[PDB]
Every structure is written in C-alpha cells, then in structure tokens.
Design a protein around this nucleic acid. Structure first.
Ligand SMILES: Nc1ncnc2c1ncn2[C@@H]1O[C@H](COP(=O)(O)OP(=O)(O)OP(=O)(O)O)[C@@H](O)[C@H]1O
Ligand SMILES: Nc1ncnc2c1ncn2[C@@H]1O[C@H](COP(=O)(O)OP(=O)(O)O)[C@@H](O)[C@H]1O
Ligand SMILES: Nc1ncnc2c1ncn2[C@@H]1O[C@H](COP(=O)(O)OP(=O)(O)O)[C@@H](O)[C@H]1O
Ligand SMILES: [Mg+2]
Ligand SMILES: [Zn+2]
Ligand SMILES: [Zn+2]
Ligand SMILES: [Zn+2]
Lengths: 338, 502, 592, 97
DNA sequence: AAAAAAAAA
C-alpha cells in the first residue's frame, strides 16, 4: 500500500490516509459532517478499489569470495525494490546495484531491547545485470558470418575436440565422445508413442591420476546445462528439491521426487562408486528418461527427467589387474552397466 | 415467550411414549414396549432410554418424526420435560432429579465423512468410520451452584455453555452481586465426557488423497464404547464449536495463511475475531467390525439340546466327526484339536507354585498335505485366537518389544502375538525359521506362562497364558522314514519336551 | 458503477432471447442456445448456467457488457442472476419450484491463462483464468450468515442479519416491556451457516524453463464448488482477484503494510454399448486377437500374453459359510535376463487395468505422523489400494527381508492385520500379484536350476499360481527376425472398450464348472501323477500337487469368465492343462 | 507429587496406559520409588483448570488423588496369607514366638 | 541445529 482509502458509508467524502512506515493502523471515526454529528452514521470501511498500491519485492546479496579477507565468513545485506524495477534480477548472478542506504527500526521484532541499535537496508534505484548472456542462440548477422567461417573451416569436429581442454594432453577418443554427447542422439519419439531418449549415457573408467575429473570440470564449465554432484557431502542435492523448509513460514513447498535440473541437463559425477543406496536408486529411477515418482506426503509432482549421465569412477583396488576384467568393472550392479 | 411448537411436539412425544401399544408376536397381544422399558429402569436402576427411529417414523408421519429429527437441538429440552413428566407420572421413586438420556437408533441411512455439510447443523444424523484415538474419561460440569461471597446466598441450576459461566445477579434485595461467586463443588452435578477421533475408511477414499478427519464427543453411558481401530457407526446431532481462547476466560491466553471466517463486533470479544469448526455430538454407538450361571440362561432349546447331547451314548464318536468338515481325512489330528480346545484344569499349590493347565500340539508333514487348513479353521472358530507366521516383520516378533521415541519419554512396550493370545489359542505357522531371541523366549513363555523383561530402565512381568498350536516342515522337504523326529527336525531338544502331542 | 444497472440488463436479455451460435459459426468461417437450455433447466429442475465469453464476445452490444463485466464482476453477476430469476417466470408464461431455488452463472474463457510469475497489482479485482495442480484441500469452514440472539431474562429471540462479517450487536432487547440492556445472549448452534473451503494450487511445471521453483496461490470456493477437486488434480479455474490485510498481532489493531493475495473463483474445469460387446463376443478367434491386442510392439511371446490376459480376466470368488472363502486371485512371476523388455508388459498391464498400483523393491499400512498438521493418521499401503485389481511389482529379487514375510501373509490369507500405537484391526487386500525377477550374473545359465539363479525362498516361489521363463539365446534366425521387427517399428487395437468389457465380465458374469469337466480334471491329475513315478523304486519327485489342482480349476473358470459364457466346457480344461504343463515342461534342470 | 501409570500386568493387551497424579503429605515422603509397582488407598477429588478447559472447549475438570495409605506390591504377588500395609512386620507376641 | 547413549538388525 501507498495510499489507503476508506469508504464512509454514503457520508459525503471518503476519508483518505497515508502511511510510509512498515506498520499501519486503521481509523475508527471519520470527519464526515453528518458523521461528525452527535451520533454516528455508518462505520467506515477500507475500500480496495479506491486505494493505491505498489509492487514490493525484497532480496539479499552476498559478498564475493574474492573480497572476503582471510579467516572471515561472508556477510549479507537486504535490499528492497519497488516500482517498475521489480523482477529485474534473478538468483545466481553478479550485479552492481545503485541505491539509497536507509535505516529500519528494530521495533518490528518487539523485544523492548536494543535501545539505540537498529537494522539497515538498501533501496534499489538502478541495476546493471552484468555477468554474461546465453541469449538462447538468438539469430544475428555476426554469428551468421561466424558460422560461415566455420563452414569454410571444413572438417570441424577434430578441431573442436582439440579446443576443449588443451591442458590435458592427448585422449582424443574421449573428447570426440564428449563432442558427440553434446549434440544428442535420436529423440522426439517414434510411431505409436514408443519412448526413445536423445541423451547419451557414457561412463569413464580409469585409475586415479588421469585427469578425468579435470576433463569433467572442463566439460561442465563449457556446457551451460552441466551440473556436478557426488556422494553425500551435501544432502539437499539428491532425492529432494532445494525448496525444502525454506520459506520463513515453513510452508513446506515441495515437488516430491526430483533431481537437480534433471530436465535437459548434463549430470556429472566423480567417484561414481561412492554414493549410498539413495542416490544409486535415484539413478536407477532416472534410467532411460524415466520420470521420478517418489512420494512421501501424497505428492506426485513428478519431474520429467531427461538428462545425459556422466560418470567417472575407479575400481576399489585403484588399479587394473591381469585377471578377469569384469571382476573389477565398477563394483556396481551389471544392470546399471548395461 | 411460550414456544408452543416445542410444547406440541413434547405432547405428541409423551403420547406415543405412553400409548405406542405395538404387538410383536401372536402371543404378544399388547406389549407396551416403553412401559416395559420403564419397568426395567425400575428393577435395575437405569437412566438411559432407547427409541427406534422406525417406531417413531409412523407416528404422525413427517409432522412429528421430521419435526424432531431436523430441529433436534431446538426440541431436545421439550422431549426431556415430557419424559420426566411421564416417568414421574408412572414412577416417582425412579427420579431419586436424575439426568435422563435418550438414544435414537435405526436411522434410514448413514452418511460418509466427505458428505458432511454445514446445512445440517442441529439435525439428527448417522455417520461411520474408523476410530483412531480416544481420551480419558474426565468429569464435566453440567449444573453449577454458586455462593455470593459477601452475603452467602445460594444461586444454583446455572446452565453452562462452552465456557465456565458465573451468575449475573443475586436475588437478595440488599445485595447487588458486586462481588463474584464461589463454586460449590459438593452441590454441583458432573457428567462423563470423552472425545474420540474418526476418519474415512479405505473403501470410500479415492486415489492417493489423504483421509478426512472428524472429532466426536461422547457423553453419559456411551464412554469407552469405541476402542481404537474398530469400525463403528455413530448416531447423534451435528454441532459447531468456536475458539474459546478468544472468548473471555479467567486464564491467560496450513494455519499461518489465515483467511478463516472471522467474526468480530461483540462486547466480550473486544477487538478479537471468532472462528468456528465442525464437531459431532453422539448419543448411540454400535460396531460393525460357573455351570449354574450357564444354566441361568434358560430356554426350551437350551434345556432340550443340551440334555440330549449329555444323555447320548456315542457323543465322542460323533464329536470328532464334527470338527473341520471341510478337510479330508486326518481323524487323529481332529481328535487332538478337539482335546486341545477343551483344555485342562489349572491348579495352584498352597505356597504359590503354579501348575500348567494347557495342551500344546505340533503338526509336522510334507508340503501341501492340508496343514494350514486346521490353523485357519481353529482361528475362525476358537474365540480370542490369533493367526501368526513364524517370521514376524514387526519388532515385537512373538513375545514383546520395547519402543521409545527419539528423545521421547515413552519407554513403552508393544505386545506380541503371544501377548494378544491371552486366554486363547495362538496359531503360529512355519515354526522352523524362528530366530534365537524368540527361540529362547518361547520355552520360558510355554512352561512358566509368563514373560519377563528388563531393558533400558523399564522392567515388567507380562502374563502369557496361552494354548499354542504350531506347524512345521521337515528339513529336506519330505519326512525320511529311516530317521527319527530329532534327526529330521531342526528344533532343539528342550523345545520338544515343551510340546504335549505330535 | 451506476451505469450497468439499467440498459445492460435489457440488452443482455434481448440477446439471451435472440442469440444463435450461427454468428460464432460465421466468425469461425469453417441454434438458440439460451432458450433451449432454459427449457432443459425447467424440465430438469436444476439451477446452473454455463456461459462462454467468446459467444458473449461475438455480439456488438454485449462486448460493452463484456468489458463492464471485466471491471465490475460482483455487481454484473448479481444483476445477471436476478435477470435469470425473472427470465424463468417470463418464459413459463409452476411458480412453486422457482421460489425455492436460486440461480447462478459460471462464466469462463474470459481471457488467456496467466501464471503466478506475472501478476501485477494493476490486475486487482479483475477476472483472470488459471491452470494448475491441486496440492492440498481443507475441511469445510462454517461461515456466519444469520445471527440468533435470545433475551435470557424473558426468553425472547430475534434474528439479525450481518454484512462483511462484522455484526452489529443490539444493545437492548426489542421488547420494551422488559427492555433490559445486558439480557441479550448469542446462541451458537441455532444460527445459519455457509460452507467455505480453501484450496491450495500450484503452477503447472511448463512455466518454469530454467529449473526454478513453483509458486503456490490460495483459492476459495463456495457451495457447489466444495470438494470438486482432490489432491493431484489438474484443473483450470475462472475467478476474480483479491487482497486482504494481515492481522499480525492478534492482541492489537496494528496491520502490516503488505496484503496477502488470494483468488475467489466461480468456475472449474479439469485439464447401450453392451450391444457392441456381444458382437465381438461371438467371434471364434477372439482369444488370439484379444491376447495380441494388449502388447502391440512385443514380438512373439504369445503364451505369456495369453496368460497375462487370462489373469487380467480373473477367476471367481466365493465365501460359503461352512468352509470359508477361497482365493480367486491369480499370481504370475516373470524371470529372464534384462534384455526382454519385461518392464514394458508391467507398464502395459498397469495402465490397461482399472485399478492397480505399480511399485518396486512400505507397501502395506503404517501409522504416520501428519506433516502440515500435528496429528496422527492411519495410512493404507500399496497392496491394500489394489483391492480387486492387479498389483504390479518390479525388481522382485531385491525385496529386503522384512517385507517378504508380509507377502507370505497376504497371499495365503488375503487379510493383513496391524497392532501399533494401540490400534488393532484387520484390513482386506484381495489383490493379484504380477512380478518380474532377474537372475544373478550377466546371464541365466540353463544348466543351473531356477532356484539358485533367482535367489528367492522355495516356498514363496512354490505358492505362486504360475511361472514363466525367458531365455534369450543367440541364433541367426531369431536375431534376424527381432532386428527386422525393431527396425520396422523404429521407422486391430481396441480402446477403453477393453476396460469396460473387463468390468462387465468381472461383475455381471459368474460362471460355474459342470460335472463333465470333473472327469477330465481327475484324468489330468492322474496323468501328471503317473508321470511322477517310473519303472524304478527311487521314489521320484512328487510333481502333481493340489496347487496344480487349484491352478487348473481357477484357470478353467477364468477361461469361462472370458467370452461371457455361463458354464465351462472341455476346451477350457484342455487350455488350462496345456498352459500349466507348458511352463512345467520348461522347469527341468540339467538332468533329464 | 508423583505420576501413576497402569500396571502392564493388568492393562488390556495392545492398548495404552492411563496416567494420574498422586499427592503425598507428611510421613509419606520418599516411601515410593521410581519403577516400583504400588497400591495406594486415597481420596478422589477434582479441581478447576484453565488451559484444560481451553484445549477441550468444554467445562472439564482435572482430577488428582491424595494418598492415605501405600502398600508395595513388587514381586510378591502372593497376597492372601495375611492382611495389612506390610506383611514383613512383626508384633511383640510374634517376636516372643 | 548438534552431541551422546541404547536396542535391534
Ligand atoms: N594427461 C594429463 N595432462 C595434464 N594434466 C594431467 C594429466 N593427467 C593428469 N593430470 C593432472 O592430474 C590432476 C587432476 O587429475 P585427478 O587426480 O583429479 O584425476 P582423477 O583420475 O579423476 O583422480 P581422483 O579420483 O584421484 O581425483 C591435475 O593436476 C592435472 O594436471
Ligand atoms: N480337504 C483337503 N484335503 C487335502 N488337501 C487340501 C484340502 N483342502 C485344501 N487342501 C490343500 O492343502 C493346502 C494347505 O496348505 P499347507 O498344508 O500349509 O501346504 P503348504 O505348506 O504348501 O501351504 C492347500 O494348498 C490346499 O491346496
Ligand atoms: N523383444 C523386444 N522387443 C522390443 N524391445 C525390446 C525387446 N527386448 C528388449 N527390448 C528393449 O530392451 C530393454 C530391456 O529392458 P528390461 O529387461 O525390461 O529392463 P529390466 O531390467 O527393468 O527388466 C527394453 O527397454 C526394450 O526397449
Ligand atoms: Mg578424480
Ligand atoms: Zn458515515
Ligand atoms: Zn449476594
Ligand atoms: Zn427481553
């Protein structure tokens, strides 16, 4: 609210009120002349149509890891935005906001303490989104001449494989496989509705000290949809969404069975033999674009998982052996391997 | 103001109470069923009366039956007055002044929980569901008596409501009730009160949605009549309960979204809003799921059939033939089961030593020779019997177990099948794959008829007076005639001595 | 405003009596709806009107009423309902059924569907359309409409109307004979109430392209809209927008500067055939076509398809008193290497069957602690939910150990009991089981018998009705045929007709066996008994068990259940014995 | 004051116990011990409570038991030979015998 | 939210 209006029950003018504080109090009696008479004429009521409103949104901003002095924990800062600038920023980007730094009373908490201590917040005025733009490959002349240059370049896939990770030496087959993975296989169904998935599921086997993790980091960085996960370490990454018990009201917003950006994503995992039974069962649920249908409280908001699987792991002995090779494999069930 | 409609319905009520005059059978010319009921209350000192809705239905058609059913709360005191009038007309000494209660039964239809709507508030109704929780039988204030402290006058018969209400005036002319009153506990009259919870059955509920829950309040003689887990049918009147917290009280004062139907503008509420919630009031509950004492239950068939069975000469020859007619063959198993079902005498020594008075029977055979049929038949015939598998999925297993909430002060025990089978027959199937804990608890539960436990600060000695019947399969599948019982079975020697027949 | 009161009513009445959808037909460029619908209401007795905006938009005078409806919903709807109340009497010229009923409209398709991600404050008190998924419902909330007071001193009652929820309490009884101010007391249970219900709604997942989280918008319904939606339902609604202040502290009169938003709706939408049956039922080769219709893409595997269809048909159930109930369910197990597409058949049967739950390797009832509300609720499991249907189990080998015994309880008795938290009760399941299993290792070696490879208890396997084995072995011809068939797919099927036919067979048809088939059954039992011994006294394995007898009787009865017959014939018993002995003939180990 | 549950040997199987509150006046302090099954003879009385009325929405009253005699009944279930609060107490004549 | 003790698998 910016200006709050009350209807006066046909008693002439409708009394208005203006409040700028975060706490608001209503009226009880009005200054209408017949209402100002020695007996009341109708109880004043708040009218939603006549009053004026304004969009409100609040966020917080974190310090960058570069600017934090050693041995310290990054701090936060609330920010308020009103007007047409609403919805001009999204979580997970680097920005530089310009605005007014204003105090906010601590009396909202209502503890009768902090006689002079008060909270502070910033009011947004102008923002530069900064960072980078994916642009959804929007067609433009410059990139048209760029793809003309690529066409004139002739055979391209070997060059692209050479250009991914020059830091790691050789290993052309894995780079070619990654390039073929980045495009995707046959998709968009067949006749009668039989399911076919265009994502390719490739697993990398090797001993420690081969820089398969480095190549995985490179492909994750270069792919906008790449995500890296691992066995535990963080709990809100598998079999659960990121909105669990998040809101201040503890509204318990939840989708049920879902993964991290499982739709058209590139899941990358190191130590694919490490994770517990829960994440392994999650992968067994995601096999072949299968939807995630794990329910806990009557929810069935299944996430349409269609993702490529990138798995890097080693045999638990950490080295290859001259004996039968399936004895090493991945120390994982053969159904997943097939 | 004289509510003549209430007076008229009360007059009709007492009329068909006094002169219903229905006939039951040919020999029953005139019964006067309610007069006989009043005679029963005379000779047994009862307080509740039972009225069939169908017997009420044909009296004045819908001019009386519907008039009572729809506005039940409106006309309840008039019916109470009529009942008191007729009782004190026919039995004044019965009044020695007492809370008479009326329970209507046999309603035409029953409603589901999902069909409960606000337009039926104050109307007689019948509902059904699964009871999942009860509460302690707490006394309830019904008619309070008060003393005006500064003048010690007596004001009584103060009807109560959903809050504890004090009087508002003092009849003494010199006094003007400026001070409040002191409740006279020994002069007030209390009544029983118990709150139960019900939910929709698995039959009605569609899809994977959550069941709908309702709260039912009992009163009077219908306490402890709905045990948890039982599917029951309730008959009563729809009511609504507000939030007493917003209401004035001597004491100190999904959900976060609000948007409740709040009402404000009263004197006592001040600036507070009043909300409401649907609750059900019940008055009738039913469930759909010494030799001289026996001789006292006298009837023509009771005398004739029992005398014929006693005076016969080939009862035993016939008796074993009447056990489990479905199964084919196995005469000795039938005789053994009959002998188990009769049971043995239980005696105690002069110094407190107990002697076991039960028969334990085991059945061994190769697969598919109709061994589970006897178990199922004895479960379906013997009262207080329980069917159980040898391997139990629950932590209780066979005897008992202790469960406690994580950082919770429960420290309670859960009852195993042997505990539930008290004074009955326990029918365990597939005896072979029991585990060590049960395998060593059983031969204490069998011979000594008790179970003792001491874990995590709680100790108890539970009663396990049971008659066990078990089945098993020989090791290797088929009984090898070359070897003996010990060679084929994998049971321990002490367990075999426990059993009485094989 | 004071404009729509006078002329809009007359204009819309004129276009009510003069509308024809030929105008909409011409606009489309590929009849009196209102009067015929009102006459249908008159002959039906209901009170309900549907009203599309596009047809309302097709007329030039009405589009002004369209825009005024957008701006002022409540007044337009009220005057429209009053107009229809008058129109009933204007058209009938029994006047008795009209004075009891009211009239309401259900406008829809006013505008394009908008999402929770774009809701400006400029759209307050305007009509919008929403699509979403229902998350949770609430019990009916009584709403105050009429107060009932009583002068306790003189026992005099009066009825007081309310408005906007706020009630003006009378400070004195109207009876001047007593005229006391403080003698007025409210009666809670003698008033009149309305049934309000709050619905929680979430946005459809199609509005979130970049892995963000969905948002939830509260909903409100009245009267006929109560309980019209349940959990997981996909609906579209039409209603106005609203805002409301927050009380914050209930002790004071302070109000927050932010208003909660909620939507009040008036509209919801979701997202003699027996003659045709007997025409099909008279066809001679209906069995083969019906068996092959279930799995259109699966190549060969005819016998397993026949068995699955027959078990979908199901046997009979009887509960004679002196002997007890007999099982009517059929349970089948599938085994083979993970190269058979055996999960596709599971999905096929799951979606074809009327009732059924598809799970994996918890399945039964357990007491749960309710999440949003701090209460205790009893919840039933997957097996209980499949009463009368087919319960589908996948990955049966990794079944743990605690749950398996539960199955050992649910097949032999078909009644599961629970004793926890003071609750002792028994629940009915009466469900059919169809499961799939995988051998241990990369392949199923034919030399080893079945028991070792599957790793299942011998009794649990023994108590199944049937068992099917699939062995994919490398040959030129079969591999060529599969390659051709799969490539052709890569480059005669009925409809839900199947479902209603199955229902009719289940509940109208109760066939019985005749005396003639008894001789054949006894002969078959003897025949499989005679094979079980040979010219040596080695006491060969007893392969002819009574489980085989129940298998053939149930299968023969289920065959007679198919084709809508009433008494069995020989063909049923030969089919049953051949079907069982085909599986038995493939049950042999490396010896013999 | 102490909390009194139901003895597991007399509760119906599979059900839940019931709790009451017992008040011990002078000369009865520390007579009872935790975990020990007892039998108390006392007086039944009722008193008003505010929160209890608030939660149930009906005029319900709390109940307590003030003890007047306590008899320990742990282990020795044989209680027919003689009467009294204790069976291990002797009179002067029994000492003489 | 995080540490530490107990019964059952
Ligand atoms: N062929 C290579 N070219 C360049 N650097 C390499 C190569 N192989 C390994 N490295 C070095 O290995 C390091 C990263 O490899 P890393 O040990 O993470 O591989 P990994 O096989 O995934 O092992 P682990 O599971 O133990 O982490 C880097 O320091 C990188 O320089
Ligand atoms: N009257 C009867 N005579 C012989 N056998 C029967 C009779 N009725 C049922 N049966 C068979 O006996 C079996 C009983 O199960 P059970 O004896 O426990 O064998 P299993 O241990 O294999 O379940 C049933 O499967 C049924 O086929
Ligand atoms: N005869 C066949 N016709 C069509 N598809 C087949 C056939 N055999 C195998 N497949 C394919 O191979 C896969 C086999 O997987 P499956 O064995 O069902 O996995 P699971 O281990 O879950 O049983 C199927 O997804 C199917 O697409
Ligand atoms: Mg690594
Ligand atoms: Zn006014
Ligand atoms: Zn006084
Ligand atoms: Zn009055």
């Amino acid at each position: 609210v910016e200006v709050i209006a009350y209807t006066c029950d046909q008693c002439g003018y409708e009394v208005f009120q203006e409040v700028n504080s975060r706490t608001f109090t209503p009226l009880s009696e009005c200054t209408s002349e017949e209402c100002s008479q020695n007996q009341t004429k109708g109880q004043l009521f708040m009218s939603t149509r006549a009053s004026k409103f304004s969009a409100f949104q609040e966020c917080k901003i974190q310090e960058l890891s570069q600017q934090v002095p050693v041995g310290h924990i990054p701090r936060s800062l609330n920010i308020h935005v009103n007007g047409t600038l609403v919805r001009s920023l999204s979580p997970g980007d680097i920005v530089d906001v310009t605005g007014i730094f204003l105090p906010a009373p601590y009396t909202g908490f209502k503890a009768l303490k902090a006689g002079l201590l008060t909270e502070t917040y910033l009011e947004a005025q102008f923002v530069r989104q900064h960072k980078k733009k994916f642009a959804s490959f929007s067609l433009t002349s410059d990139v048209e001449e760029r793809v003309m240059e690529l066409i004139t370049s002739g055979d391209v896939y070997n060059r692209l494989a050479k250009s991914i990770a020059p830091e790691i030496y050789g290993n052309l087959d894995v780079k070619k496989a990654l390039l073929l993975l980045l495009v995707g296989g046959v998709d968009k169904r067949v006749g009668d509705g039989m399911k076919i998935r265009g994502d390719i599921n490739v697993c990398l086997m090797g001993d420690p000290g081969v820089a398969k993790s480095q190549l995985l980091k490179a492909i994750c960085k270069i792919s906008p949809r790449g995500v890296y996960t691992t066995g535990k370490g963080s709990s809100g990454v598998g079999l659960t969404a990121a909105v669990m018990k998040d809101p201040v009201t503890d509204e318990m917003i939840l989708e049920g069975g879902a993964l991290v950006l499982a739709d058209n994503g590139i899941c990358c995992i190191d130590e694919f033999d490490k994770m517990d039974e829960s994440d392994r069962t999650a992968i067994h649920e995601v096999m072949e674009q299968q939807t995630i249908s794990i329910s806990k409280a009557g929810i069935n908001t299944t996430l349409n998982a269609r993702t490529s699987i990138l798995a890097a792991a080693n045999p638990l002995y950490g080295r290859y052996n001259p004996r039968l090779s399936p004895l090493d494999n991945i120390n994982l069930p053969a159904a997943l391997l097939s | 103001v004289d509510d003549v409609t209430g007076e008229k319905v009360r007059e009709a009520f007492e009329q068909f109470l006094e002169d219903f005059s229905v006939q039951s059978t040919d020999t029953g010319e005139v019964e006067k069923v309610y007069r006989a009921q009043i005679e029963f209350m005379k000779i047994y000192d009862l307080n509740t009366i039972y009225i069939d809705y169908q017997h009420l239905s044909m009296r004045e058609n819908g001019a009386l039956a519907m008039a009572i059913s729809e506005q039940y709360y409106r006309f309840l005191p008039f019916l109470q007055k009529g009942l008191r009038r007729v009782v004190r007309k026919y039995a004044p000494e019965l009044l020695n002044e007492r809370v008479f209660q009326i329970s209507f039964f046999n309603l035409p239809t029953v409603h589901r929980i999902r069909d409960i709507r606000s337009e039926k508030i104050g109307s007689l109704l019948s509902i059904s569901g699964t009871v999942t929780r009860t509460s302690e039988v707490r006394p309830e204030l019904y008619k309070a008596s008060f003393t005006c402290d500064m003048c010690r006058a007596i004001v009584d018969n103060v009807e109560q409501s959903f809050k504890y209400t004090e009087p508002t005036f003092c009849p003494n002319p010199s006094c003007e009730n400026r001070a409040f009153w002191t409740l006279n506990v020994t002069r007030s009259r209390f009544l029983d009160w118990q709150k139960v919870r019900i939910q929709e059955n698995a039959n009605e509920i569609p899809t994977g949605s959550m069941p709908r829950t309702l709260d039912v309040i009992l009163r009077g003689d219908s306490v402890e009549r709905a045990k948890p887990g039982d599917r029951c049918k309730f008959t009563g009147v729809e009511i609504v309960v507000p939030d007493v917290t917003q209401l004035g009280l001597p004491g100190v004062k999904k959900t976060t979204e609000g948007l409740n139907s709040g009402v404000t503008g009263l004197r006592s509420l001040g600036v507070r809003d009043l909300t409401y919630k649907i609750s059900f009031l019940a008055c009738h509950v039913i469930s759909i799921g010494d030799q001289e004492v026996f001789l006292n239950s006298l009837s023509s068939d009771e005398i004739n059939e029992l005398k014929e069975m006693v005076k016969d000469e080939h009862i035993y020859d016939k008796l074993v033939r009447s056990i489990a007619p479905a199964v084919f063959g196995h005469e000795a198993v039938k005789k053994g089961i009959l002998l188990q079902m009769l049971g043995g005498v239980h005696k105690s020594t002069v110094e407190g030593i107990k002697l076991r008075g039960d028969i334990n029977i085991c059945v061994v055979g190769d697969p598919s020779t109709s061994k589970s049929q006897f178990l199922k038949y004895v479960v379906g015939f013997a009262p207080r019997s329980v069917y159980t598998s040898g391997k139990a999925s629950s932590a209780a297993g066979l005897t008992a177990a202790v469960v406690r909430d994580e950082e919770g002060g429960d420290y309670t025990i859960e009852a195993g099948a042997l505990m539930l089978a008290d004074n009955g027959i326990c029918c365990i199937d597939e005896f072979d794959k029991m585990d060590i804990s049960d395998q060593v608890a059983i031969h204490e539960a069998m011979e000594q008829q008790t179970i003792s436990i001491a874990k995590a600060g709680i100790h108890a000695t539970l009663n396990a007076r049971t008659s066990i019947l078990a089945a098993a399969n020989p090791v290797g599948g088929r009984y090898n005639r070359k070897l003996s019982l010990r060679g084929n079975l994998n049971m321990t020697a002490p367990i075999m001595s426990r059993f009485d027949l094989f | 405003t004071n404009v729509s009161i006078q002329e809009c009513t007359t204009n819309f009445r004129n276009f009510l009596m003069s509308f024809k959808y030929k105008f909409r037909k011409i606009l489309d460029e590929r009849e009196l709806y209102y009067i015929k619908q009102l006459n249908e209401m008159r002959e039906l007795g209901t009170s309900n009107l549907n009203l599309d905006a596009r047809n309302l938009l097709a007329y030039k005078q009405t589009e002004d009423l369209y825009h005024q409806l957008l701006n002022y919903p409540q007044e337009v709807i009220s005057i429209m309902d009053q107009t229809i109340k008058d129109c009933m009497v204007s058209l009938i010229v029994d006047l008795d059924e009209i004075e009891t009923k009211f009239y309401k409209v259900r406008p829809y398709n006013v505008g394009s569907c908008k999402g929770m991600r774009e809701l400006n404050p400029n759209d307050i008190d305007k009509l919008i359309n929403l699509k979403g998924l229902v998350l949770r419902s609430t019990p009916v909330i009584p709403d105050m409409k009429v107060a009932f007071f009583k002068c306790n001193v003189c026992d005099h009652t009066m009825a007081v109307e309310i408005d906007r929820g706020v009630i003006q309490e009378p400070a004195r009884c109207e009876r001047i004979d007593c005229n006391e101010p403080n003698s007025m007391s409210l009666i809670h249970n003698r008033c009149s109430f309305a049934d309000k219900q709050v619905i929680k709604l979430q946005e459809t997942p199609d509005f979130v392209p970049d892995g963000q989280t969905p948002h939830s918008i509260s909903l409100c319904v009245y009267d006929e809209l109560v309980d019209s939606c349940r959990a997981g339902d996909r609906i579209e609604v039409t209603g106005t927008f609203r805002s409301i202040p927050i009380r914050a502290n209930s002790r004071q009169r302070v109000l927050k500067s932010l208003y909660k938003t909620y939507v009040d709706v008036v509209h919801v939408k979701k997202v003699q055939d027996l003659a045709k049956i007997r025409e099909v039922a008279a066809r001679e080769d209906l069995y083969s076509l019906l068996a092959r219709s279930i799995a259109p893409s699966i190549y060969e595997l005819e016998d397993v398809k026949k068995g699955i269809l027959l078990q979908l048909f199901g046997g009979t159930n009887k509960t004679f008193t002196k002997g007890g109930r007999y099982r009517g369910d059929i349970n089948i197990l599938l085994c083979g290497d993970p190269s058979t597409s055996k999960s596709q058949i599971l999905q096929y049967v799951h979606k074809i069957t009327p009732r059924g739950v598809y799970t994996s390797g918890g399945l039964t009832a357990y007491i749960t602690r309710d999440v949003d509300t701090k209460q205790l609720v009893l919840e039933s499991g997957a097996l209980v939910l499949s009463d009368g249907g087919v319960c589908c189990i996948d990955e049966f080998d990794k079944m743990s150990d605690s749950t398996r015994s539960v199955l050992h309880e649910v097949m032999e008795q078909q009644t599961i009991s629970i004793a926890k938290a003071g609750i002792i009760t028994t629940l009915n399941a009466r469900s059919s089981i169809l499961a799939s299993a995988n051998p241990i290792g990369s392949r199923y070696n034919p030399n080893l018998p079945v028991t070792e490879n599957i790793d299942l208890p011998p009794p649990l396997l023994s108590r199944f009705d049937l068992v099917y084995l699939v062995l994919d072995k490398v040959d030129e011809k079969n591999d060529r045929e599969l390659a051709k068939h799969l490539t052709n797919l890569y480059l005669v099927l009925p409809v839900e007709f199947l479902t209603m036919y199955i229902s009719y067979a289940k509940e109208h048809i109760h066939p019985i066996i005749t005396e003639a088939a008894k001789t054949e059954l006894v002969r078959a039992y003897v025949g499989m008994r005679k094979m079980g011994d040979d010219s040596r006294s080695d006491e060969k394995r007893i392969t002819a068990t009574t489980r085989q007898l129940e298998s053939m009787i149930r299968l023969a009865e289920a065959h007679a259940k198919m084709k809508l017959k009433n008494v069995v014939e020989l063909e049923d018993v030969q089919e049953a014995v051949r079907l069982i002995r085909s599986a038995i003939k493939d049950y042999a180990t490396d010896p013999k | 004051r102490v909390t009194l549950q139901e003895a597991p040997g007399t509760v119906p199987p599979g059900r839940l116990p019931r709790h009451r509150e017992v008040i011990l006046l002078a000369d009865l302090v520390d007579v009872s011990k935790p975990g020990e099954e007892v039998e108390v003879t006392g007086i039944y009385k009722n008193n008003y409570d505010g929160n209890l009325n608030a939660k149930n929405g009906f005029p319900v009253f709390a109940t307590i038991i003030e003890a007047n005699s306590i008899k320990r009944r742990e282990g020795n279930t044989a209680n027919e030979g003689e009467e009294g609060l204790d069976v291990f107490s002797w009179t002067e004549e029994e000492e003489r015998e």
